[PDB]
């Protein structure tokens, strides 16, 4: 019940500015202190700073100087990080974390935020096209048909694909998006199902690309290739 | 700043095996900390103080070490253990993390189910043709996919995507996507995808003729 909820994902422009939230619940805010960790494929996990909401006392990693301040709100039970002058070096996941200086004998990251993914680029928001990946004979082996949805030409990450509306979760694979020549992303979300179902059961993929503010639902219609 | 280095970078581990990763430090550290991180979610508190297990963590996880030498160790490896493990120190400001040890589960060989998908009619209307080949639930990751267009091998016009090692089984899935202009696509008949994988008794070809269905 001690959640540490964070903002989802952000599009920032080169050399701009960003404030990300980190709201707390399930514990006295001021009685624990708040940290901020950066993650990138390279350089991995990098601590950035911390703040004690008992007063607003801080501490800063040298590497992020002149770009990572940690302000804290009124009793909205929340900590904040502002990043400034953003280069494509700053595209990253940003975690906030809570410390208990004592679980047994050491200071220790007890609970974590979900992480805010930041994309730095000047490129315009774009909604995906959704195309069916149709099940047929080529999709059947041992009574299981594969089918899917092609989520094409969108920017930035992320999208979310649910099938039927979360009613179908078993055997789903939503592939990581891949950057194309165009500068636009693409992915496929597939699922396997009983082939005997194809004719009775309807399969719809719900695509949500929050940045462009566009939802699409595509009924994946099976094909008859005998 | 204490630089923390981990070994091995990738730990191949069969299910039920006893394995061990090590965290080495630039200077002496008082205590060691470990997280489990599965792609897409935040790092999960796993070990606090070199010995103690965070709540929820099974007692097949064990931990050890003093000075600059530490070791997280899993007594019997399980499927859900596939993740990256990071160590972390508090002693020297700033707190710093290992580069991580990725635990890869060496399950038995599973051959992919292979499927090919023709471009939808809606996409063709839009002026582009994406044909996608799907390789499902296979191990190991090493898979070779090869597009043939009217028997000519293709190059430079496809991209692959791989899921992460699955939680329950230890298989991967992969999609190879071929992009052609609507026009180039109609200049040919046979669109074929050919998979080579250790579990397949022989390379497998899934194909179709353009416009048959």
């Amino acid at each position: 019940q001690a959640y540490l909820q964070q903002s989802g994902a952000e599009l920032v422009r080169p050399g701009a500015s960003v404030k990300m939230s980190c709201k707390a619940s399930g514990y006295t805010f001021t009685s624990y202190n708040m940290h901020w960790v950066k993650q990138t494929p390279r350089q991995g996990l990098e601590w950035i700073g911390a703040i004690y909401p008992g007063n607003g006392d801080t501490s800063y990693n040298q590497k992020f100087k002149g770009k990572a301040t940690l302000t804290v709100d009124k009793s909205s039970s929340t900590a904040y990080m502002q990043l400034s002058s953003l280069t494509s070096e700053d595209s990253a996941v940003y975690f906030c974390a809570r410390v208990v200086y004592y679980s047994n004998s050491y200071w220790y990251f007890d609970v974590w935020g979900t992480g805010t993914t930041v994309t730095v680029s000047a490129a315009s928001t774009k909604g995906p096209s959704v195309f069916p990946l149709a099940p047929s004979s080529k999709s059947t082996s041992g009574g299981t048909a594969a089918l899917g949805c092609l989520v094409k030409d969108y920017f930035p990450e992320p999208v979310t694909v649910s099938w039927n509306s979360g009613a179908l979760t078993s055997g789903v694979h939503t592939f990581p998006a891949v950057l194309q020549s165009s500068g636009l992303y693409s992915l496929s979300s597939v699922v396997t199902v009983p082939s005997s179902s194809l004719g009775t059961q309807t399969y719809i993929c719900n695509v949500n690309h929050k940045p462009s503010n566009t939802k699409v639902d595509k009924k994946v219609e099976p094909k008859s290739c005998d | 700043q204490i630089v923390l280095s981990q070994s091995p970078a990738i730990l191949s581990a069969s299910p039920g095996e006893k394995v061990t990763m090590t965290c080495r430090a630039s200077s002496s550290v008082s205590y060691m900390h470990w997280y489990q991180q599965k792609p897409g979610s935040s790092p999960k508190p796993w070990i606090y103080a070199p010995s103690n297990l965070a709540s929820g963590v099974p007692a097949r996880f064990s931990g050890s070490g003093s000075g600059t030498s530490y070791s997280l160790t899993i007594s019997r490896v399980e499927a859900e253990d596939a993740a990256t493990y990071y160590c972390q120190q508090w002693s020297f400001n700033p707190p710093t993390f290992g580069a991580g040890t990725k635990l890869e589960l060496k399950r038995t060989v599973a051959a992919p189910s292979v499927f090919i998908f023709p471009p939808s009619d809606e996409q063709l209307k839009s002026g582009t043709a994406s044909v996608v080949c799907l390789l499902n639930n296979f191990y190991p990751r090493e898979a070779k996919v090869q597009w043939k267009v009217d028997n000519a091998l293709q190059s430079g016009n496809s991209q692959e995507s791989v899921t992460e090692q699955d939680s329950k089984d230890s298989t991967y899935s992969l999609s190879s996507t071929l992009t052609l202009s609507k026009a180039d696509y109609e200049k040919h008949k046979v669109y074929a995808c050919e998979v080579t994988h250790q579990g397949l008794s022989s390379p497998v070809t899934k194909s179709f003729n353009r416009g048959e269905c």
Binding site: N33, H35, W47, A50, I51, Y52, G54, D57, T58, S59, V99, Y101, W107 | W90, N93, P94, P95
Partner: peptide
């Protein structure tokens, strides 16, 4: 020498450092 937890930053050992 500032501690990582700014709650420990007061003067429990930082003053002596």
């Amino acid at each position: 020498c500032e501690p990582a937890n700014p709650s420990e930053k007061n003067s429990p050992s930082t003053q002596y450092c």
